[PDB]
Design an enzyme around this catalytic site. Structure first.
Site, mmCIF file in Angstrom:
data_model
loop_
_atom_site.group_PDB
_atom_site.id
_atom_site.type_symbol
_atom_site.label_atom_id
_atom_site.label_comp_id
_atom_site.label_asym_id
_atom_site.label_seq_id
_atom_site.Cartn_x
_atom_site.Cartn_y
_atom_site.Cartn_z
ATOM 1 N N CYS A 60 26.533 32.603 -28.384
ATOM 2 C CA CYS A 60 25.069 32.587 -28.268
ATOM 3 C C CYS A 60 24.456 33.645 -27.471
ATOM 4 C CB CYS A 60 24.421 31.158 -27.851
ATOM 5 S SG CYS A 60 24.901 30.800 -26.059
ATOM 6 N N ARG A 71 25.307 27.551 -24.739
ATOM 7 C CA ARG A 71 25.376 26.776 -25.875
ATOM 8 C C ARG A 71 26.578 26.894 -26.718
ATOM 9 N NH1 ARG A 71 19.826 29.382 -28.753
ATOM 10 N NH2 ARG A 71 20.761 31.102 -27.684
#
Length: 408
Positions: A362, A367
């Protein structure tokens, strides 16, 4: 308003029906409800926990029905506790489903149940409470264990309330400037020692946000902690369970100066930029963006300190959430991991598949770590995190960038 005629699983299959497991996802995933009890869900079952219903609107339930290809008049057979089954029946009736039965033989053949290959990596509150209380639990740690809250910065919310016996790790202990990549192996070694973690210590991480815990977890797996687990849904699930809490500054932890294996034991769990580049334009590998759609199409970088906009050219979209700090596409209404079948389907649509070498990224890695942990629990055998992500990639303008609306 009563249930249609009861169906066995074989009957349901021969009538092209669908089973719906009304229990919380922990049990759907494979946690037994009692020691050595049935583990998992019936073949091809959907999970619609009665506990989610008060957080699902009409639109959200209609969306769920559509996303799972439930035909208006096809048989659906519910199972679980009687109260949960009734609650779900009532919502599904009001949603328009016309053939709702009980699955009469549900859970009566433990051998035919399906589970997450490594469900035990995604624990739930009662399990952790029972562990702490010295009770026998399923998939008990082999030996020593630690529970640790992870968040950015010095303890804030942790000081007010935390899980009893939990330590605290500041994410800045595992990553740093200038790229928000993980710290060096030597610094990881120091961090592990300070928090009393050997390679054979089980570590259960949780966060107010799951991705903070996941980031620390994935870096620990890289280092060589063998047994690393997450509390599914994070702190909020503990809070909502009404379980006991502790407060105040983190207690003193006994240090473990000898990790017991050379760090890093699992270097393949992290990729650098050139390794990530090597996964592009292939059918046997995917570099997967866990970035919000506005990030993926280049409307925003997602971060105040990242000026370049766009995406890694050739990267496949993995879904994510509404903005750079959310992960709704991976979460149930209670914050727990969505069903493996559903994650699998959303990845398959973008040509991301378990037989591939798959690396997630990311902006800077948080994430991607959450998705790594889910894919690991799902039994995907060749997963990693490309740490540098978009921050590193776009630091060099010569690296190919994709932008705008596009598809698989």
């Amino acid at each position: 308003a009563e249930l249609a005629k009861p169906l066995t699983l074989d009957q349901l299959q021969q009538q092209n029906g669908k089973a719906i497991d009304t229990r919380p996802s922990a049990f759907y995933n494979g946690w037994p409800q009692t020691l050595n009890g049935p583990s998992g869900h019936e073949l091809a079952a959907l999970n619609l926990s009665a506990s989610w219903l008060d957080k699902m609107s009409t639109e959200q339930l209609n969306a769920w029905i559509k996303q799972h290809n439930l035909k208006t008049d096809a048989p659906v057979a519910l199972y679980g506790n009687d109260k949960d089954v009734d609650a779900v029946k009532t919502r599904l009736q009001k949603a328009g489903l016309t053939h709702i039965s009980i699955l009469s033989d549900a859970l009566s053949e433990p051998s035919r149940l399906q589970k997450l290959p490594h469900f035990e990596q995604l624990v739930y509150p009662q399990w952790l409470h029972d562990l702490q209380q010295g009770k026998e639990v399923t998939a008990k740690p082999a030996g020593d264990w630690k529970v640790i809250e992870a968040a950015w910065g010095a303890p804030k919310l942790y000081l007010i309330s935390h899980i009893p016996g939990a330590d605290y790790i500041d994410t800045n202990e595992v990553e740093s400037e200038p790229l928000w990549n993980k710290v060096s192996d030597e610094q990881l070694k120091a961090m592990l020692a300070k928090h009393g973690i050997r390679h054979d210590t089980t570590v259960i991480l949780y966060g107010r946000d799951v991705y903070a815990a996941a980031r620390v977890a994935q870096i620990m797996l890289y280092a060589g902690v063998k047994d690393v687990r997450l509390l599914d849904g994070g702190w909020q699930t503990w809070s909502d369970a009404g379980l006991p809490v502790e407060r105040g500054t983190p207690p003193k932890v006994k240090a473990e100066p000898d990790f017991g294996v050379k760090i890093p034991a699992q270097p393949q769990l992290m990729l650098d930029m050139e390794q990530a580049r090597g996964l592009l334009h292939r059918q046997d590998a995917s570099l997967v963006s866990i970035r919000s759609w506005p990030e993926f199409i280049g409307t925003t970088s997602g971060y105040s300190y990242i000026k370049p906009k766009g995406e890694i050219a050739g990267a496949r979209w993995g879904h994510a959430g509404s903005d750079s700090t959310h992960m709704e596409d991976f979460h149930n209404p209670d914050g727990t991991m969505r069903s493996a079948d559903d994650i699998t389907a959303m990845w398959k649509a973008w040509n991301i598949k378990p037989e591939q070498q798959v690396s997630f990224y990311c902006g800077t890695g948080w994430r991607a770590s959450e998705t790594f942990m889910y894919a690991r629990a799902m039994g995907w055998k060749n997963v990693s995190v490309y740490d540098g992500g978009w921050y590193e990639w776009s630091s060099d303008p010569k690296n190919p960038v994709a932008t705008g609306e596009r598809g698989p």
